[PDB]
Amino acid sequence: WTATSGSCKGRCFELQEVGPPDCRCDNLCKSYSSCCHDFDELCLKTARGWECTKDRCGEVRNEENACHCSEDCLSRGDCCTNYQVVCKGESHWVDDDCEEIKVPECPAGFVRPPLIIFSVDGFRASYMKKGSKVMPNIEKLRSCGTHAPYMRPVYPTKTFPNLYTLATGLYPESHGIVGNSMYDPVFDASFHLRGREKFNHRWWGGQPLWITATKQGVRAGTFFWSVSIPHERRILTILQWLSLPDNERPSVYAFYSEQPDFSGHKYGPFGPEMTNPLREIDKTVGQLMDGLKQLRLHRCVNVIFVGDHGMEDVTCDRTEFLSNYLTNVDDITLVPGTLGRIRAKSINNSKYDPKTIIAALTCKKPDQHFKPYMKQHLPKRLHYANNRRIEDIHLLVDRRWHVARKPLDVYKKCFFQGDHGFDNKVNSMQTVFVGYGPTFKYRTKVPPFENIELYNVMCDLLGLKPAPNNGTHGSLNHLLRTNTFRPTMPDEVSRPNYPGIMYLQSEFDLGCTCDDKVENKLEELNKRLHTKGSTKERHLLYGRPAVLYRTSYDILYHTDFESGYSEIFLMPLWTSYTISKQAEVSSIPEHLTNCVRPDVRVSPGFSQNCLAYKNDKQMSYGFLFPPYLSSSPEAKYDAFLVTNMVPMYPAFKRVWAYFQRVLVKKYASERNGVNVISGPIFDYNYDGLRDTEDEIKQYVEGSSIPVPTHYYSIITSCLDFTQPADKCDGPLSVSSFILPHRPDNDESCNSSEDESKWVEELMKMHTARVRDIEHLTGLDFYRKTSRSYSEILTLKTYLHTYESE
Numbered sequence: 001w002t003a004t005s006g007s008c009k010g011r012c013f014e015l016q017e018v019g020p021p022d023c024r025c026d027n028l029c030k031s032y033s034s035c036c037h038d039f040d041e042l043c044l045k046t047a048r049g050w051e052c053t054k055d056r057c058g059e060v061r062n063e064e065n066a067c068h069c070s071e072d073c074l075s076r077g078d079c080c081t082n083y084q085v086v087c088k089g090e091s092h093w094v095d096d097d098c099e100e101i102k103v104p105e106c107p108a109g110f111v112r113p114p115l116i117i118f119s120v121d122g123f124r125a126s127y128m129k130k131g132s133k134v135m136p137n138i139e140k141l142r143s144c145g146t147h148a149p150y151m152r153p154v155y156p157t158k159t160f161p162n163l164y165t166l167a168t169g170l171y172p173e174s175h176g177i178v179g180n181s182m183y184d185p186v187f188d189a190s191f192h193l194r195g196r197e198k199f200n201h202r203w204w205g206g207q208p209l210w211i212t213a214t215k216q217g218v219r220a221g222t223f224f225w226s227v228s229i230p231h232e233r234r235i236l237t238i239l240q241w242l243s244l245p246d247n248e249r250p251s252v253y254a255f256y257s258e259q260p261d262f263s264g265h266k267y268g269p270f271g272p273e274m275t276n277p278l279r280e281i282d283k284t285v286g287q288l289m290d291g292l293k294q295l296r297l298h299r300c301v302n303v304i305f306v307g308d309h310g311m312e313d314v315t316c317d318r319t320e321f322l323s324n325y326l327t328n329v330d331d332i333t334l335v336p337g338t339l340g341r342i343r344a345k346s347i348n349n350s351k352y353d354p355k356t357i358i359a360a361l362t363c364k365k366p367d368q369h370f371k372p373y374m375k376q377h378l379p380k381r382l383h384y385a386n387n388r389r390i391e392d393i394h395l396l397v398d399r400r401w402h403v404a405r406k407p408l409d410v411y412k413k414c415f416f417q418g419d420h421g422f423d424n425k426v427n428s429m430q431t432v433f434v435g436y437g438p439t440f441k442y443r444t445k446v447p448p449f450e451n452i453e454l455y456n457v458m459c460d461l462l463g464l465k466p467a468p469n470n471g472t473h474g475s476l477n478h479l480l481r482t483n484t485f486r487p488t489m490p491d492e493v494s495r496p497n498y499p500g501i502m503y504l505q506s507e508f509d510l511g512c513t514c515d516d517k518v519e520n521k522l523e524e525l526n527k528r529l530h531t532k533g534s535t536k537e538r539h540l541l542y543g544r545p546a547v548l549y550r551t552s553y554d555i556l557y558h559t560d561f562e563s564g565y566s567e568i569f570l571m572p573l574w575t576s577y578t579i580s581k582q583a584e585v586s587s588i589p590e591h592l593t594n595c596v597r598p599d600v601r602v603s604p605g606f607s608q609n610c611l612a613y614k615n616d617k618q619m620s621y622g623f624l625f626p627p628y629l630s631s632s633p634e635a636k637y638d639a640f641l642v643t644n645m646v647p648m649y650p651a652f653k654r655v656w657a658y659f660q661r662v663l664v665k666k667y668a669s670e671r672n673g674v675n676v677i678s679g680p681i682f683d684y685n686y687d688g689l690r691d692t693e694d695e696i697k698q699y700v701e702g703s704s705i706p707v708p709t710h711y712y713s714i715i716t717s718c719l720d721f722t723q724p725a726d727k728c729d730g731p732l733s734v735s736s737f738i739l740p741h742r743p744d745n746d747e748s749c750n751s752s753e754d755e756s757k758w759v760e761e762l763m764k765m766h767t768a769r770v771r772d773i774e775h776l777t778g779l780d781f782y783r784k785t786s787r788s789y790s791e792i793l794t795l796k797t798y799l800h801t802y803e804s805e
């Protein structure tokens with residue numbers, strides 16, 4: 001119940017939202033149908049439009065007018081944004097030369113530069129170049145401020161997930177807004193774009209920037225705007241708030257534009273109808289900058305121009321229908337469109353089997369434009385599993401396509417030409433970032449970065465301590481003139497043991513054999529030095545990774561590789577090796593085909609055993625350091641140590657062998673040597689974090705050998721590829737992956753073909769950031785470089801996307 005008989009007199013765009021049944025005057029009241037009776041008359045004035053004219057200059061103040069051209073308007077903070085231009089011979093901000101803003105130039109009584117977040121729905125990254133001729137205000141922010149070529153959204157590339165990620169620094173799986181549509185089985189409640197459930201605070205997890213600000217004594221404007229408040233009025237409201245007294249004035253504000261998303265859905269991302277929405281957004285930016293300039297705030301405020309996601313060409317005719325695959329289609333509920341999520345129509349249906357649904361959806365049509373996944377098998381880079389609101393079955397949809405349950409869903413609802421929601425590495429889904437103001441750098445381009453990082457930077461801009469989030473605080477310090485965040489490297493929790501030769505061959509009863517009994521003081525001291533770490537500076541380029549949890553492990557040195565060997569998991573946490581451009585690939589000799597050798601530095605009790613692999617008819621083994629890349633026939637024996645062995649499904653070995661035998665040497669040739677760190681990952685509860693021993697769901701039959709869920713590799717070289725990886729003076733280049741350790745290649749529809757036709761495509765899909773691997777392993781990499789720690793944090797957040805320009 002709303003007692004709408006209260007009044008908005010003196011309350012228009014109140015920041016403190018008053019509680020029912022008292023009627024509301026805030027920028028959301030319209031959305032809750034709760035505004036006081038006189039809200040439109042008092043708060044949404046339109047009389048005489050939005051622009052001063054020659055005739056209105058020095059006019060008598062008429063309080064019915066939308067904005068003012070009277071002599072008192074600047075003191076009152078309610079001038080039309082073009083007042084000084086029309087009435088005082090001033091220039092529009094866009095016509096002024098760019099001048100470096102070295103220091104905040106703020107009015108007396110400003111404690112900190114305000115932040116204004118100018119958020120634009122569906123603003124695709126390529127609009128900055130393709131629309132530059134029609135967006136002069138935005139082009140001036142972009143060229144004079146700090147900009148990225150693009151900013152990577154979160155998956156799914158939908159509105160609410162991305163806006164709430166911007167506000168919180170969290171993955172959707174953690175903030176809980178995992179789609180524009182959601183069912184929460186614990187609440188038994190549905191979140192929809194239309195209707196009231198979405199306003200319930202139980203959907204919205206983490207701590208958004210406006211709450212972080214308020215809790216630390218920093219006042220915030222209300223970020224959400226009702227669609228019916230015109231953009232001109234949102235801008236005049238922000239400018240009025242900025243004119244409040246020091247004790248009442250917010251330090252942080254958001255503007256939101258429904259464009260260009262709204263038009264992009266109707267006309268496609270580059271439809272000729274898209275020019276006018278881009279012009280209209282640019283005019284709004286011009287109104288804000290002219291308005292700041294009038295208030296002497298244009299060299300005081302930090303402005304962020306940011307999008308939520310891009311926009312792709314999508315039409316009704318590019319729809320896959322589940323009714324073409326499933327006999328049982330009425331037994332499922334599909335969340336449809338540019339992604340799919342499937343659950344049982346009824347939890348009382350005992351016959352519902354997700355295994356049968358996945359199999360019916362797997363590689364059934366030659367050009368099939370979606371791929372089914374159990375959510376724990378999705379690429380780890382999506383971080384899209386650890387939430388009860390994410391259905392177990394997921395459909396990753398090809399760019400330009402939709403999935404729907406039945407044809408009647410598509411033509412009983414063509415109209416639309418654009419959509420978004422696809423995989424967040426897709427070029428069409430990329431969005432924009434520009435930072436302009438005293439705290440941002442001047443005329444600076446920064447590399448592309450992920451929107452999860454912005455919450456930390458917005459906290460840096462406001463002097464706030466950020467709530468715990470998925471950003472890497474410091475990874476964006478290169479955007480900032482000042483207020484940088486200078487973290488310390490995490491403390492190593494476990495120190496390694498450095499075992500020497502402690503066990504005799506005959507103490508091992510592992511069921512292992514090797515034809516290695518083939519026999520010199522020249523090269524007997526040489527092998528001793530290799531085992532004491534004489535080549536370690538060649539194979540461990542960036543220091544040993546730090547172990548950030550309590551465990552028992554050993555450093556093992558060899559001629560060609562170094563490893564941190566876990567006594568708890570009976571395998572390496574990490575294996576490190578350098579392959580020069582000149583390295584040669586060799587075969588596994590016939591005599592060593594099934595060779596596994598005891599490691600005399602490591603107790604039989606802390607070793608794997610071959611008999612477990614022989615007995616396990618599903619499980620085989622591979623090697624973390626590839627025998628194919630041994631430096632010499634004698635060094636190759638080291639690669640067959642039981643301490644280099646890891647459990648591998650035969651289906652996965654096809655992937656691993658091709659990576660090790662073909663791709664490592666290819667990368668070394670292309671990059672002028674590579675350093676590789678490889679290892680296992682255990683994430684049985686799909687939370688993106690290292691499992692403890694007691695979370696492991698699968699062992700090699702009859703053993704305590706745990707089965708990884710994933711295998712990682714981090715492949716580092718010199719950004720200046722004229723310098724070899726092992727002699728690099730400057731910045732580094734990295735590519736990484738987290739390959740799912742699966743007992744089939746059902747993910748790869750072309751897997752019956754030679755590995756050269758499908759393994760690289762699989763590895764590209766499972767590209768990762770070093771930071772993703774850190775979360776999954778509890779390791780901290782790049783501890784010992786020449787480089788600034790902030791530069792290393794940027795490197796650790798890099799994602800190699802394999803997309804074109």
Ligand SMILES: *[C@@H]1O[C@H](CO)[C@@H](O[C@@H]2O[C@H](CO)[C@@H](O[C@@H]3O[C@H](CO[C@H]4O[C@H](CO)[C@@H](O)[C@H](O[C@H]5O[C@H](CO)[C@@H](O)[C@H](O)[C@@H]5O[C@H]5O[C@H](CO)[C@@H](O)[C@H](O)[C@@H]5O)[C@@H]4O)[C@@H](O)[C@H](O[C@H]4O[C@H](CO)[C@@H](O)[C@H](O)[C@@H]4O[C@H]4O[C@H](CO)[C@@H](O)[C@H](O)[C@@H]4O)[C@@H]3O)[C@H](O)[C@H]2NC(C)=O)[C@H](O)[C@H]1NC(C)=O
Pocket residue numbers: 170171173174175176202203204205206383386387388468469470687688689775
């Ligand atoms: C991305 O960044 C985020 C933020 O840093 C990381 O998320 C954190 O991960 C931590 C580890 O998973 C997690 O810590 C847990 O917190 C529990 C208390 O949580 C509540 O309070 C916090 C603080 O106010 C709040 O943020 C939480 O919010 C979550 O839950 C609500 C639902 O009520 C959601 O609205 C909100 O969206 C958020 O959901 C997300 O997190 C939860 C898990 O907390 C997920 O289940 C959701 O799917 C969603 O992803 C909560 O309101 C605390 O109880 C936990 O403690 C257990 O574990 C410790 C281990 O140290 C153990 O020693 C304790 O005894 C305890 O065990 C007991 O409980 C077990 C579970 O019931 C039980 O099995 C045992 O038998 C024991 O009795 C734990 O400390 C932290 O909450 C989240 N924070 C957020 C915001 O998500 C995330 O990891 C990062 N991602 C990556 C890849 O790095």
Ligand SMILES: O=C(CCN1CCN(C(=O)OCc2cc(Cl)cc(Cl)c2)CC1)c1ccc2[nH]c(=O)oc2c1
Pocket residue numbers: 117119121159163164166167180193223224225226254255256261
């Ligand atoms: O329903 C909507 C939008 C609903 N609101 C979004 C939030 N918004 C707003 O003012 O957010 C401001 C804001 C909030 C936050 Cl958390 C963070 C910041 Cl940086 C800024 C008001 C409109 C919509 C829009 C586009 C869509 N495309 C599509 O397929 O479905 C769509 C639905």
Ligand SMILES: [Ca+2]
Pocket residue numbers: 121122158159160261308309
């Ligand atoms: Ca959107």
Ligand SMILES: [Ca+2]
Pocket residue numbers: 682683684685686687688689690691
């Ligand atoms: Ca885990």
Ligand SMILES: [K+]
Pocket residue numbers: 613614615616617618619620
């Ligand atoms: K086996």
Ligand code: NA
Pocket residue numbers: 745746747748749750751752
């Ligand atoms: Na296959």
Ligand SMILES: [Zn+2]
Pocket residue numbers: 122159261262265420
């Ligand atoms: Zn949209």
